[PDB]
Amino acid sequence: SGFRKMAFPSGKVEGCMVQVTCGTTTLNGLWLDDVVYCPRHVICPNYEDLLIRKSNHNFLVQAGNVQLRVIGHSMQNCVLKLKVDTANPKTPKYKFVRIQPGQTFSVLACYNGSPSGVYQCAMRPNFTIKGSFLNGSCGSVGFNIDYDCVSFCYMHHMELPTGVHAGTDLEGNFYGPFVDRQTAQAAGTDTTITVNVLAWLYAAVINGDRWFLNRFTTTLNDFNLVAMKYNYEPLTQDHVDILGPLSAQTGIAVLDMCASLKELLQNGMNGRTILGSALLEDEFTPFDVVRQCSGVTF
Amino acid sequence: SGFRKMAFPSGKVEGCMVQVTCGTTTLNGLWLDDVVYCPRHVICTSEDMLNPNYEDLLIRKSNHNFLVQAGNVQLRVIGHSMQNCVLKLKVDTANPKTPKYKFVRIQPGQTFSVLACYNGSPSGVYQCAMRPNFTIKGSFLNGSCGSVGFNIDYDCVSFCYMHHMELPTGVHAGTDLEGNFYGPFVDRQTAQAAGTDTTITVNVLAWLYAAVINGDRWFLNRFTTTLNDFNLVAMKYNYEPLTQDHVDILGPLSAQTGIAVLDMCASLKELLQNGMNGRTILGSALLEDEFTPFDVVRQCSG
Numbered sequence A: 001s002g003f004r005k006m007a008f009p010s011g012k013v014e015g016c017m018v019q020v021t022c023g024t025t026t027l028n029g030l031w032l033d034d035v036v037y038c039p040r041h042v043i044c045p046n047y048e049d050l051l052i053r054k055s056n057h058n059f060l061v062q063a064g065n066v067q068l069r070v071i072g073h074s075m076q077n078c079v080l081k082l083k084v085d086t087a088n089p090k091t092p093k094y095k096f097v098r099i100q101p102g103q104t105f106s107v108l109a110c111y112n113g114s115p116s117g118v119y120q121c122a123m124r125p126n127f128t129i130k131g132s133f134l135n136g137s138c139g140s141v142g143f144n145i146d147y148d149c150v151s152f153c154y155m156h157h158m159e160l161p162t163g164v165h166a167g168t169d170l171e172g173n174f175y176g177p178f179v180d181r182q183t184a185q186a187a188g189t190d191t192t193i194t195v196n197v198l199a200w201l202y203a204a205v206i207n208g209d210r211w212f213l214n215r216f217t218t219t220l221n222d223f224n225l226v227a228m229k230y231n232y233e234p235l236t237q238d239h240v241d242i243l244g245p246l247s248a249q250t251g252i253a254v255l256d257m258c259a260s261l262k263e264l265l266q267n268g269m270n271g272r273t274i275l276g277s278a279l280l281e282d283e284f285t286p287f288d289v290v291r292q293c294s295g296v297t298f
Numbered sequence B: 001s002g003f004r005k006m007a008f009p010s011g012k013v014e015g016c017m018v019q020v021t022c023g024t025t026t027l028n029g030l031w032l033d034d035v036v037y038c039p040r041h042v043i044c045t046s047e048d049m050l051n052p053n054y055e056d057l058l059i060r061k062s063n064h065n066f067l068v069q070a071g072n073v074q075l076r077v078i079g080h081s082m083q084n085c086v087l088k089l090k091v092d093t094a095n096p097k098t099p100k101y102k103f104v105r106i107q108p109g110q111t112f113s114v115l116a117c118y119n120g121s122p123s124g125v126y127q128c129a130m131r132p133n134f135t136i137k138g139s140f141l142n143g144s145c146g147s148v149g150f151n152i153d154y155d156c157v158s159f160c161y162m163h164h165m166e167l168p169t170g171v172h173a174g175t176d177l178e179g180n181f182y183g184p185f186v187d188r189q190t191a192q193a194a195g196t197d198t199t200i201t202v203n204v205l206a207w208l209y210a211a212v213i214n215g216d217r218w219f220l221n222r223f224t225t226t227l228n229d230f231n232l233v234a235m236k237y238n239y240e241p242l243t244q245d246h247v248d249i250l251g252p253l254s255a256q257t258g259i260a261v262l263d264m265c266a267s268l269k270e271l272l273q274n275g276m277n278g279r280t281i282l283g284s285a286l287l288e289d290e291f292t293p294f295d296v297v298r299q300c301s302g
């Protein structure tokens, strides 16, 4: 029993964290094979012009107490790729994957190439992450683990004025309408990840919390009209299908659970809690709930 | 900016997780140097569990009865001993991934990261606190026994917990790495119940200071309180008494935010009386008590 916000074991990613220093700026880099990936703003804008003025010896890469020698540099979108002479012997089986909003991933927060913490979070529908980052965290990465393969999905670039965070996939493409420059940028109005709230309601049922269940069912049309009204993301047939296993395990159809969520939105919790929370949690995907309530290992 | 429930990077602990099998029971072990630590109940059947005599059951075991697996390699047990509720299996290979480590026993309110494992394989990492009733509110399934709680301050892993059991309420009980249980619990299937849980007051105040540091000030008020008046009010909401030790510990956060401890205590009294009124503090509609004063400073400063 128990339901916790749980991150993937960070070991395979810790072996890849290095410190990248260029001029006065120090941030984190991801060392995979003979390449170190990091935010291109470490060179700080006309990034092609600024990068052409840099030489390999301008970038100081440190892996533990060992300095790696940079033998090449290139830019792919907002990520800088520093070719090094030594392949990381701790390189795990990995992929670069771009995730969708509502998808969750673990963040290994680093400072000076050293991992300091690990937390689980979701790519908000407004493409920001509500992370926890101090100055020097840039280059910290977000990932998932699929069997024994680390899928790198995020690299931290900046903090928006509201305290939320923005970054790119490992190909340097930003999540959201953000740019890597000091300019007026604002996160759009956020919405709730509906499929994730339903997955979390199924996790609560699996854990014995049933007070919110009701005799009612609804249609995807009637539910989405209510979802739009309460700044909840539309629930697609894809989402209903993904919730299928949890629906079969708990005996509560997805539209039956949707009627529970509909009542929770129109009436509130009434002093009650679900899994120790007075708010509806939306940072557990249907796959996270299955993984945690069945015991998948890495 | 931002405030998250954050666990320590689990890498140093992952390299120590192994699978321990004795008879029909399979659970997790912690492999440090040439010793594998695991709950001693691995030597029990479900029949032995009501009133087990562990000295008697262990004397009947031989080294070849314990099968230890580190990845796809079987380790050879060359000795076995029991220290309180932990079984120590001496092995013929020192773990090359052994980090710098310590065994530390923590007090209620202290937080730690848990690396949840099944069959010697890490499946997840989360943040916990030792509840005042000495249980932990974990996320554990059958087979998680032997999963450990730790803190990684600097480059040394301080092992503070090993999971042993789930109480009837879904809360969890375990021991330090010396086999001493936290709480009035025993490693038997006898009727055991967690005492009434209370909110960790010093941790809630630390979390209110974290919210002030992050720009949330709505809950602040012009009032102060005596320590005794605060405790008379807090006790009524099932909150732990706040000691002078706790007030002293909150000192640095009080200096950083400019809000005296007894002044923040008056905000807490008001929050307990009024509730949140549709508002949230650091994205939470409840008062969070699983961040210590040390966690807040580490997260909000480095």
Ligand SMILES: C[C@@]1(C(=O)Nc2cncc3ccccc23)CNc2ccc(Cl)cc21
Pocket (backbone or CB within 6 Å): A001, B041, B049, B140, B141, B142, B143, B144, B145, B164, B165, B166, B167, B172, B186, B187, B188, B189
């Ligand atoms: C092995 C056992 C135990 O609590 N296992 C579990 C431990 N953690 C989570 C679980 C969830 C679901 C079922 C079991 C779980 C069984 N009864 C008992 C009694 C005493 C001791 Cl010291 C250990 C145990």
Ligand SMILES: [Cl-]
Pocket (backbone or CB within 6 Å): B084, B085
């Ligand atoms: Cl004992």
Ligand SMILES: [Cl-]
Pocket (backbone or CB within 6 Å): B105, B106, B107, B110
């Ligand atoms: Cl302690």
